[PDB]
Amino acid sequence: ALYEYQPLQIETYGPHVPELEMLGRLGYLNHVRAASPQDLAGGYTSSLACHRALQDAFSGLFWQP
Amino acid sequence: MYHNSSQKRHWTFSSEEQLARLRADANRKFRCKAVANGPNDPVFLEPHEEMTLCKYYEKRLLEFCSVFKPAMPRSVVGTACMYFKRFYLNNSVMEYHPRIIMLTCAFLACKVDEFNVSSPQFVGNLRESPLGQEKALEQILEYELLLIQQLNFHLIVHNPYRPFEGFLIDLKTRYPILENPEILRKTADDFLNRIALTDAYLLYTPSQIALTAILSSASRAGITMESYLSESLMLKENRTCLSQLLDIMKSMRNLVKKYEPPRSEEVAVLKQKLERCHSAE
Amino acid sequence: KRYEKLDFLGEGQFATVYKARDKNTNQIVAIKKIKLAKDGINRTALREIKLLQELSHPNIIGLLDAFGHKSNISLVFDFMETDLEVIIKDNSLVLTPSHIKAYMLMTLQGLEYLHQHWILHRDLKPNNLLLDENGVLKLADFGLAKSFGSPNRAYTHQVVTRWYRAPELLFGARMYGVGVDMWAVGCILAELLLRVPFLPGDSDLDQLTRIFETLGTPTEEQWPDMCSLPDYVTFKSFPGIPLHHIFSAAGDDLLDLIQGLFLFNPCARITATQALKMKYFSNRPGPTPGCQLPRPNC
Numbered sequence: 116a117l118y119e120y121q122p123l124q125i126e127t128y129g130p131h132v133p134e135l136e137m138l139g140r141l142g143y144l145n146h147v148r149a150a151s152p153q154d155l156a157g158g159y160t161s162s163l164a165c166h167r168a169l170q171d172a173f174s175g176l177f178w179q180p
Numbered sequence: 181m182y183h184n185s186s187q188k189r190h191w192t193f194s195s196e197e198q199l200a201r202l203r204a205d206a207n208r209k210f211r212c213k214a215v216a217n218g219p220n221d222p223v224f225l226e227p228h229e230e231m232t233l234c235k236y237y238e239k240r241l242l243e244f245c246s247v248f249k250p251a252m253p254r255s256v257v258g259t260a261c262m263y264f265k266r267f268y269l270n271n272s273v274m275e276y277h278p279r280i281i282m283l284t285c286a287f288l289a290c291k292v293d294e295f296n297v298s299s300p301q302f303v304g305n306l307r308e309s310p311l312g313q314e315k316a317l318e319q320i321l322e323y324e325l326l327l328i329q330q331l332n333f334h335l336i337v338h339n340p341y342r343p344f345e346g347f348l349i350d351l352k353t354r355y356p357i358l359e360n361p362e363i364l365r366k367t368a369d370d371f372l373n374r375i376a377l378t379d380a381y382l383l384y385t386p387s388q389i390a391l392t393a394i395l396s397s398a399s400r401a402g403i404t405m406e407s408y409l410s411e412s413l414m415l416k417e418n419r420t421c422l423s424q425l426l427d428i429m430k431s432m433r434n435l436v437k438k439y440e441p442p443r444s445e446e447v448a449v450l451k452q453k454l455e456r457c458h459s460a461e
Numbered sequence: 462k463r464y465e466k467l468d469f470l471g472e473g474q475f476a477t478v479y480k481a482r483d484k485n486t487n488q489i490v491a492i493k494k495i496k497l498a499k500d501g502i503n504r505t506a507l508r509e510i511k512l513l514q515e516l517s518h519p520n521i522i523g524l525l526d527a528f529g530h531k532s533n534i535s536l537v538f539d540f541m542e543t544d545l546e547v548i549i550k551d552n553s554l555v556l557t558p559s560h561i562k563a564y565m566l567m568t569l570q571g572l573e574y575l576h577q578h579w580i581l582h583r584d585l586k587p588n589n590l591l592l593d594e595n596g597v598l599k600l601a602d603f604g605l606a607k608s609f610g611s612p613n614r615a616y617t618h619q620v621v622t623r624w625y626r627a628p629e630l631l632f633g634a635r636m637y638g639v640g641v642d643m644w645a646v647g648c649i650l651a652e653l654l655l656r657v658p659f660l661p662g663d664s665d666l667d668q669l670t671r672i673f674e675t676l677g678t679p680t681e682e683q684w685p686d687m688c689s690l691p692d693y694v695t696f697k698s699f700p701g702i703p704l705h706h707i708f709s710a711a712g713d714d715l716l717d718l719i720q721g722l723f724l725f726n727p728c729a730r731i732t733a734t735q736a737l738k739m740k741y742f743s744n745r746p747g748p749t750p751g752c753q754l755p756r757p758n759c
């Protein structure tokens with residue numbers, strides 16, 4: 116009855132969004148405002164912003180009803 | 181996320197013909213209900229008249245949102261306009277007046293989005309006397325539940341603005357042959373408003389709308405960025421999808437093309453006719 | 462209107478939860494009626510509505526329906542047997558490591574679903590993790606939950622029950638990520654292990670003092686840049702009791718998971734996705750099937 120981890124793999128119609136960690140040295144963070152120390156003290160990192168921007172830019176492109 | 185959103189499943193239709201079918205069905209059912217409770221009465225309104233009135237009152241909603249005393253974020257404005265479109269897509273302009281529903285949509289977009297406005301401040305942002313403000317506020321609270329019910333309790337609306345920013349980030353990083361996409365940002369803001377005016381929000385995903393805005397700015401800027409979709413979007417190996425994206429872009433730019441603003445005399449006559457319809461219920 | 466009321470289930474601080482049944486289908490639902498002007502539908506009811514409508518996970522209740530009148534509404538979720546607060550506070554139900562593994566696994570699955578959709582369940586506690594006859598957890602109360610993508614927003618700093626508040630929330634952080642729900646899950650885990658609320662506080666001051674006296678005041682290197690927070694008030698260097706002495710009935714994998722959940726650095730705190738990749742959930746004691754979870758009778 117052992118548990119084995121399964122990626123959730125929810126379908127997103129559109130180009131593959133680069134992964135959150137493999138996103139700082141692809142150059143993306145050069146074009147989103149830096150995480151101010153107050154922001155970075157909490158869980159915020161100014162890479163959540165870029166990742167959500169990229170994720171909703173490709174949310175549905177290759178989809179049409 | 182849009183890709184499993186309620187907006188995508190329910191409030192996004194195949195073609196403009198389905199929008200017309202739903203609006204005509206709503207208007208005709210209202211006409212039947214009015215006749216059966218009491219068919220060609222010169223006071224009833226045709227679907228194109230309803231469309232022109234809804235266009236005019238959506239322009240009114242845009243004006244009121246843009247001249248909101250505290251800065252109304254574009255998310256709330258877009259959410260309100262989408263609520264207006266959704267409500268009048270399945271309902272008639274005769275049964276519920278578009279000014280009250282305009283204000284109710286603005287209020288419910290302030291409240292569903294995390295914009296914090298006190299209701300007295302909200303109504304004090306209207307152009308009326310304080311007793312008129314109180315009447316307008318009570319009308320808004322009376323119609324809020326109706327608005328929510330007629331939206332089928334799908335209150336989350338995905339605007340093209342966040343995908344627009346994401347696409348600009350992608351253009352900045354992965355597309356080097358294009359430089360300084362800020363001019364694209366200005367012209368795409370212009371096009372994005374001009375496409376908010378039409379019915380593209382019920383027919384195309386917000387990502388398609390944002391991509392079309394940025395690429396239309398590129399086209400009108402004399403910049404060919406067709407390479408962006410081909411390579412750096414993996415579509416050069418997926419020919420059907422690339423063709424469909426170009427098709428969607430062309431179809432929706434032409435949808436922008438075949439939209440004309442509501443007239444002056446026509447809106448005036450429809451307004452007075454609407455008042456006569458509201459008086460002689 | 463269609464829902465006939467059977468029993469009074471409880472009273473959440475902003476709404477009253479009753480039990481009811483529907484006519485189209487023979488089943489049992491739970492209604493949640495908002496308490497009662499001049500400002501429309503209660504905004505908490507709209508967070509519930511707008512935010513449970515777009516999520517479809519086995520471990521998150523989806524409100525079946527919603528109705529109301531002039532200024533009051535009432536939501537309709539599926540009637541959901543119990544919650545972890547009853548099971549924890551129960552004494553006859555012994556929680557073998559398999560049971561706690563199942564509960565934590567279900568919580569973390571639901572939470573990774575929620576965090577993938579950029580929704581932060583800012584109020585997570587054992588009174589909100591519900592579980593039905595089949596024995597599947599669901600994160601119930603979405604009354605105060607937001608979206609953690611935008612840099613343009615500004616969260617108020619007190620939106621979680623105090624006992625289950627992440628320290629970065631307690632220092633009054635305007636911007637915070639998924640570390641909130643992760644510390645909440647860590648507190649739920651500690652409570653499940655000890656059957657006692659971990660770190661019971663009285664105020665922000667008391668909660669900080671107890672958190673640091675139980676886990677150790679951070680060192681500006683385990684949680685760098687803590688000086689930058691607004692409510693950063695310095696406490697002396699509490700050594701902090703080691704974790705293996707508190708959760709003595711927990712294996713090494715469980716201690717590693719608990720350490721992961723409890724880093725004072727929100728950014729270095731583990732997320733729900735990489736918490737489920739740890740060895741604890743894949744080790745030899747497999748989580749119990751929902752068909753064999755303890756039933757908190759009466």
Ligand SMILES: *[C@H](CC(=O)Nc1ccc(C(=O)Nc2cccc(Nc3ncc(Cl)c(-c4c[nH]c5ccccc45)n3)c2)cc1)CN(C)C
Binds near residue numbers: 471472538544547
């Ligand atoms: C013995 C047999 C017996 O066990 N009887 C019995 C005891 C207890 C319950 C029970 O737990 N009912 C219950 C409590 C709390 C919640 C719920 N379901 C539910 N469903 C949906 C929602 Cl949204 C909520 C909810 C959300 N927020 C809330 C706040 C407060 C309360 C609920 C709530 N809750 C069910 C059942 C049966 C007895 N005799 C002696 C034989």
